[PDB]
Amino acid sequence: SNARIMEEKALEVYDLIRTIRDPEKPNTLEELEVVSESCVEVQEINEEEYLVIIRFTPTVPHCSLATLIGLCLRVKLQRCLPFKHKLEIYISEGDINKQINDKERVAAAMENPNLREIVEQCVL
Amino acid sequence: SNARIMEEKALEVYDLIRTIRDPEKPNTLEELEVVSESCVEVQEINEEEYLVIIRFTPTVPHCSLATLIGLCLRVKLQRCLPFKHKLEIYISEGDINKQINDKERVAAAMENPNLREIVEQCVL
């Protein structure tokens, strides 16, 4: 039946993506619950052309850039200021879907050798 | 005057933090407008103990983890699926101030050799 075939195609898709390594952590997307089989749907657009829809839940860095910067500020001052002090640091209060789907943005990323290297190794 | 002294102390603070390297980009925090002199304030809490307040504007990654993951999904499928397809990928729709100020969270970060290495090199 059509439904069975679309189920089989979604499983095909899932089996390819499930073992991709996370860019930062030593585990696969499936192990980190970034994807699961139910997160994929396949439909037939026209005869023998399929649409694949994936919803994924990205991992977050163990230590974000903003956090690293804040630590640098605190550690530098703590070690190098010549007076006794307390410090309060505040993040100043003064499209990803687009980056991963737009054909031009995808190509631009894959033309950066640094990003291409990361992506190609994660999927290897 | 008190005001002059606090201005001089804030400049002291600024001169230490302005040349810290960004964790990812080849430029200093000042060059990237992560900090500027006006973003620092110093007050005297008690005699010879000062409070330093900094507001900073973090840089963002040129390519976030979520974007890298989405690229991996697309590139893997584009290269390895055995059928013609279009793909739509969606981020599923199903405290930093705390990490950089809380004494315990700061210490925990600085005990991770990986993070300590990054921080110590950025401030060197």
Side-chain angles (χ1 to χ4, degrees), chain A residues 74-92:
Chain A
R74 177 170 290 282
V75 171
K76 174 73 180 189
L77 295 174
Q78 156 197 119
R79 294 177 178 180
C80 293
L81 271 175
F83 55 81
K84 187 173 305 175
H85 58 97
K86 282 167 159 48
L87 170 64
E88 304 175 4
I89 306 164
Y90 297 95
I91 298 286
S92 178

mmCIF file of all heavy atoms in Angstrom, chain A residues 74-92:
data_model
loop_
_atom_site.group_PDB
_atom_site.id
_atom_site.type_symbol
_atom_site.label_atom_id
_atom_site.label_comp_id
_atom_site.label_asym_id
_atom_site.label_seq_id
_atom_site.Cartn_x
_atom_site.Cartn_y
_atom_site.Cartn_z
ATOM 1 N N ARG A 74 35.794 37.008 33.867
ATOM 2 C CA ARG A 74 35.887 36.888 35.316
ATOM 3 C C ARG A 74 37.277 36.430 35.701
ATOM 4 O O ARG A 74 37.861 36.932 36.644
ATOM 5 C CB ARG A 74 34.852 35.863 35.843
ATOM 6 C CG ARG A 74 34.970 35.638 37.377
ATOM 7 C CD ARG A 74 33.783 34.827 37.852
ATOM 8 N NE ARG A 74 32.512 35.594 37.792
ATOM 9 C CZ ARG A 74 32.165 36.505 38.697
ATOM 10 N NH1 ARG A 74 32.959 36.760 39.722
ATOM 11 N NH2 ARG A 74 31.011 37.163 38.578
ATOM 12 N N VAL A 75 37.804 35.447 34.968
ATOM 13 C CA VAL A 75 39.111 34.858 35.333
ATOM 14 C C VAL A 75 40.226 35.862 35.123
ATOM 15 O O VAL A 75 41.160 36.034 35.936
ATOM 16 C CB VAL A 75 39.351 33.568 34.529
ATOM 17 C CG1 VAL A 75 40.764 33.053 34.706
ATOM 18 C CG2 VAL A 75 38.377 32.467 34.978
ATOM 19 N N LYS A 76 40.165 36.576 34.011
ATOM 20 C CA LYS A 76 41.181 37.590 33.796
ATOM 21 C C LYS A 76 41.209 38.617 34.958
ATOM 22 O O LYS A 76 42.251 38.981 35.492
ATOM 23 C CB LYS A 76 40.899 38.267 32.433
ATOM 24 C CG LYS A 76 41.802 39.452 32.146
ATOM 25 C CD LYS A 76 43.192 39.014 31.806
ATOM 26 C CE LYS A 76 44.048 40.265 31.526
ATOM 27 N NZ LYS A 76 45.377 39.968 30.976
ATOM 28 N N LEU A 77 40.038 39.122 35.346
ATOM 29 C CA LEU A 77 40.005 40.158 36.341
ATOM 30 C C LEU A 77 40.405 39.602 37.714
ATOM 31 O O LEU A 77 41.066 40.269 38.533
ATOM 32 C CB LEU A 77 38.593 40.790 36.371
ATOM 33 C CG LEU A 77 38.273 41.525 35.035
ATOM 34 C CD1 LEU A 77 36.810 42.018 35.033
ATOM 35 C CD2 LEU A 77 39.232 42.674 34.784
ATOM 36 N N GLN A 78 39.940 38.397 37.975
ATOM 37 C CA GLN A 78 40.165 37.791 39.262
ATOM 38 C C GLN A 78 41.668 37.630 39.431
ATOM 39 O O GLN A 78 42.234 37.860 40.527
ATOM 40 C CB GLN A 78 39.397 36.483 39.337
ATOM 41 C CG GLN A 78 39.859 35.443 40.291
ATOM 42 C CD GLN A 78 39.220 34.122 39.894
ATOM 43 O OE1 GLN A 78 39.907 33.147 39.561
ATOM 44 N NE2 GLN A 78 37.883 34.109 39.858
ATOM 45 N N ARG A 79 42.351 37.273 38.356
ATOM 46 C CA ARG A 79 43.791 37.016 38.481
ATOM 47 C C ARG A 79 44.635 38.285 38.363
ATOM 48 O O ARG A 79 45.687 38.396 38.965
ATOM 49 C CB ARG A 79 44.248 36.026 37.419
ATOM 50 C CG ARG A 79 43.627 34.659 37.629
ATOM 51 C CD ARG A 79 44.015 33.665 36.546
ATOM 52 N NE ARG A 79 43.419 32.380 36.858
ATOM 53 C CZ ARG A 79 43.579 31.292 36.099
ATOM 54 N NH1 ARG A 79 44.295 31.360 35.005
ATOM 55 N NH2 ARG A 79 43.000 30.176 36.464
ATOM 56 N N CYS A 80 44.161 39.282 37.612
ATOM 57 C CA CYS A 80 45.059 40.367 37.208
ATOM 58 C C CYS A 80 44.710 41.735 37.765
ATOM 59 O O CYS A 80 45.515 42.644 37.670
ATOM 60 C CB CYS A 80 45.060 40.470 35.689
ATOM 61 S SG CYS A 80 45.848 38.972 34.926
ATOM 62 N N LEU A 81 43.484 41.937 38.250
ATOM 63 C CA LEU A 81 43.175 43.256 38.818
ATOM 64 C C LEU A 81 44.017 43.469 40.066
ATOM 65 O O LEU A 81 44.219 42.553 40.824
ATOM 66 C CB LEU A 81 41.706 43.399 39.219
ATOM 67 C CG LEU A 81 40.775 43.902 38.125
ATOM 68 C CD1 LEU A 81 39.311 43.882 38.618
ATOM 69 C CD2 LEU A 81 41.187 45.314 37.678
ATOM 70 N N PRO A 82 44.486 44.696 40.296
ATOM 71 C CA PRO A 82 45.358 44.949 41.433
ATOM 72 C C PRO A 82 44.607 45.372 42.682
ATOM 73 O O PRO A 82 45.235 45.767 43.672
ATOM 74 C CB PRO A 82 46.237 46.103 40.941
ATOM 75 C CG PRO A 82 45.252 46.906 40.038
ATOM 76 C CD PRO A 82 44.391 45.838 39.378
ATOM 77 N N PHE A 83 43.281 45.297 42.661
ATOM 78 C CA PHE A 83 42.508 45.607 43.857
ATOM 79 C C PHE A 83 41.435 44.554 44.171
ATOM 80 O O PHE A 83 40.984 43.842 43.292
ATOM 81 C CB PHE A 83 41.849 46.980 43.715
ATOM 82 C CG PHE A 83 40.999 47.137 42.499
ATOM 83 C CD1 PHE A 83 39.694 46.645 42.466
ATOM 84 C CD2 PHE A 83 41.472 47.852 41.403
ATOM 85 C CE1 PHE A 83 38.874 46.844 41.333
ATOM 86 C CE2 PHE A 83 40.675 48.033 40.261
ATOM 87 C CZ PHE A 83 39.375 47.501 40.221
ATOM 88 N N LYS A 84 41.029 44.476 45.435
ATOM 89 C CA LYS A 84 40.026 43.525 45.883
ATOM 90 C C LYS A 84 38.676 43.899 45.291
ATOM 91 O O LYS A 84 38.316 45.081 45.296
ATOM 92 C CB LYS A 84 39.881 43.593 47.409
ATOM 93 C CG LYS A 84 38.977 42.521 47.951
ATOM 94 C CD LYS A 84 38.972 42.482 49.515
ATOM 95 C CE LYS A 84 40.377 42.342 50.080
ATOM 96 N NZ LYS A 84 40.390 42.425 51.566
ATOM 97 N N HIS A 85 37.916 42.919 44.803
ATOM 98 C CA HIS A 85 36.704 43.282 44.057
ATOM 99 C C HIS A 85 35.685 42.172 44.051
ATOM 100 O O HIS A 85 36.042 40.991 44.237
ATOM 101 C CB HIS A 85 37.077 43.617 42.598
ATOM 102 C CG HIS A 85 37.760 42.495 41.884
ATOM 103 N ND1 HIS A 85 37.099 41.607 41.051
ATOM 104 C CD2 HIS A 85 39.062 42.132 41.868
ATOM 105 C CE1 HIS A 85 37.967 40.741 40.564
ATOM 106 N NE2 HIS A 85 39.158 41.021 41.064
ATOM 107 N N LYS A 86 34.409 42.542 43.895
ATOM 108 C CA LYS A 86 33.378 41.598 43.476
ATOM 109 C C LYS A 86 33.021 41.999 42.053
ATOM 110 O O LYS A 86 33.210 43.164 41.658
ATOM 111 C CB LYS A 86 32.143 41.728 44.334
ATOM 112 C CG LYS A 86 32.352 41.046 45.687
ATOM 113 C CD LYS A 86 31.261 41.433 46.666
ATOM 114 C CE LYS A 86 31.160 40.404 47.792
ATOM 115 N NZ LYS A 86 32.498 40.098 48.336
ATOM 116 N N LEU A 87 32.567 41.026 41.284
ATOM 117 C CA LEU A 87 32.243 41.265 39.868
ATOM 118 C C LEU A 87 30.848 40.743 39.565
ATOM 119 O O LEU A 87 30.499 39.611 39.954
ATOM 120 C CB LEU A 87 33.246 40.494 39.007
ATOM 121 C CG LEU A 87 32.970 40.403 37.509
ATOM 122 C CD1 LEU A 87 33.025 41.800 36.833
ATOM 123 C CD2 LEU A 87 34.003 39.457 36.828
ATOM 124 N N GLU A 88 30.029 41.551 38.881
ATOM 125 C CA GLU A 88 28.772 41.066 38.338
ATOM 126 C C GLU A 88 28.881 41.293 36.828
ATOM 127 O O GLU A 88 29.146 42.389 36.402
ATOM 128 C CB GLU A 88 27.590 41.868 38.888
ATOM 129 C CG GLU A 88 27.571 41.858 40.389
ATOM 130 C CD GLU A 88 26.474 42.742 40.982
ATOM 131 O OE1 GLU A 88 25.687 43.305 40.218
ATOM 132 O OE2 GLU A 88 26.425 42.894 42.211
ATOM 133 N N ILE A 89 28.664 40.239 36.062
ATOM 134 C CA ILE A 89 28.720 40.325 34.605
ATOM 135 C C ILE A 89 27.354 40.021 34.057
ATOM 136 O O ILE A 89 26.684 39.031 34.477
ATOM 137 C CB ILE A 89 29.644 39.246 34.011
ATOM 138 C CG1 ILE A 89 31.022 39.283 34.618
ATOM 139 C CG2 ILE A 89 29.741 39.416 32.488
ATOM 140 C CD1 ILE A 89 31.781 37.923 34.299
ATOM 141 N N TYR A 90 26.923 40.822 33.086
ATOM 142 C CA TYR A 90 25.574 40.656 32.527
ATOM 143 C C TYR A 90 25.671 40.611 31.029
ATOM 144 O O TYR A 90 26.376 41.408 30.455
ATOM 145 C CB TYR A 90 24.729 41.868 32.885
ATOM 146 C CG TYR A 90 24.558 41.984 34.384
ATOM 147 C CD1 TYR A 90 25.396 42.774 35.147
ATOM 148 C CD2 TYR A 90 23.528 41.273 35.018
ATOM 149 C CE1 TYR A 90 25.240 42.829 36.562
ATOM 150 C CE2 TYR A 90 23.344 41.357 36.404
ATOM 151 C CZ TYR A 90 24.205 42.131 37.152
ATOM 152 O OH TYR A 90 24.033 42.194 38.517
ATOM 153 N N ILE A 91 24.905 39.723 30.407
ATOM 154 C CA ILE A 91 24.752 39.766 28.961
ATOM 155 C C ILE A 91 23.959 41.020 28.638
ATOM 156 O O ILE A 91 22.848 41.203 29.163
ATOM 157 C CB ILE A 91 23.930 38.539 28.527
ATOM 158 C CG1 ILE A 91 24.704 37.275 28.896
ATOM 159 C CG2 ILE A 91 23.528 38.664 27.032
ATOM 160 C CD1 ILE A 91 25.840 37.028 28.041
ATOM 161 N N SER A 92 24.462 41.865 27.747
ATOM 162 C CA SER A 92 23.797 43.140 27.481
ATOM 163 C C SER A 92 22.387 42.988 26.954
ATOM 164 O O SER A 92 22.091 42.137 26.075
ATOM 165 C CB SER A 92 24.614 44.019 26.552
ATOM 166 O OG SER A 92 23.906 45.236 26.291
#
